[model samples]
Target chain A: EWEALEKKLAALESKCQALEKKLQALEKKHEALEHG
Target chain B: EWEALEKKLAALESKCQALEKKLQALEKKHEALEHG
Candidate 1:
């Protein structure tokens, strides 16, 4: 049970990191859009 | 280049915060499951 929850937490953390990367991309695009 | 990224980062950070809270709940539930 502890192991499972730990694994789930690890996966969720990974997912959040991926989300942060995608947000970075969107942020770059928005910046370009504003500059134009 | 900064403002857009800044706002996007802020929102993404907010999302992560929510996710963290949800994970905390899951952790508690898992503890209960293990203990019960």
Candidate 2:
């Protein structure tokens, strides 16, 4: 259980992560454009 | 329950939705920096 992957149960974790990652990417872009 | 992921699991189970994504390895990096 590579402790790293343990944070996720190895199932639908990826899907959830996609939503989170996209949100993160968007936030980063938004911050750069809006704050910088 | 966030239950949103359950629906996500279904999407994942269907072998659909642009293929499952990756859960990022940042979490490990985050935990590593937790104390260091």
Candidate 3:
């Protein structure tokens, strides 16, 4: 169970990182749309 | 340890949900900027 939880946490952390990257990309596009 | 891990998992899940919500909001703004 402990190992499972650790793995799950790792996977979630990876997902959060991916989401943050996507958000960053979108924000860049939004900025360009507003100011470029 | 198991309980602690579970709590940590719960916290991470909440964070993921919050990030998702933020992403959704940003996407809406981007859409409006593109199409409005």
Candidate 4:
């Protein structure tokens, strides 16, 4: 029971990590566009 | 069985929302800095 929850947490964490990378990349491009 | 997973999904989704908001704010601030 708890093991299933642990796996779900792990999966969600990885998804969040992927989101973080994409968000960071967009932020950089947005800043460049504002200046350039 | 399914109810437990549903609760967990809800919790994770809220966390994702919080992260998205913070990222959005940071992106906006970074843009302002580039322009200002």
Against the true two-chain complex, what DockQ does each candidate achieve? Answer: 0.06, 0.04, 0.72, 0.23
| lDDT for each residue of candidate 4 in A1-36, tens digit (9 for 90 to 100) | 678777777888897898879787986787988899
Candidate 4 residue B17 C-alpha distance from true site, Å: 0.5
Regions of candidate 2 where Cα sits further than 4 Å from its true position: A1-9, B1-36
Worst 10 residues of 4 chain B by lDDT: B1-10
Model 1 misplaced regions, further than 4 Å: B1-15, B18-36
Question: Which prediction has more favorable DockQ, 2 or 4?
Answer: 4
* lDDT pick, better of 2 and 3: 3
**Model 3 error, position A22 (Å):** 1.3
| CAPRI class assigned to model 4 | acceptable
Every model: iRMSD: 14.4, 10.3, 0.8, 4.2
C-alpha RMSD values across all candidates? 18.4, 12.1, 1.9, 6.1
Score each candidate by Cα lDDT: 0.66, 0.53, 0.85, 0.81
TM-score of 1: 0.50
- The model with the greatest lDDT is 3
- The CAPRI category of model 3 is medium
lDDT, candidate 2, B1-36, per-residue tens: 345655555555565344323323444444466569
Off by over 4 Å in 4: A1-18, A26-36
Q: Write the per-residue lDDT of candidate 3 for residues A1-36, one digit (tens) a residue.
A: 878887888889898888989888997886987897
lDDT of 4: 0.81
| Candidate 3 residue pairs in backbone clash | none
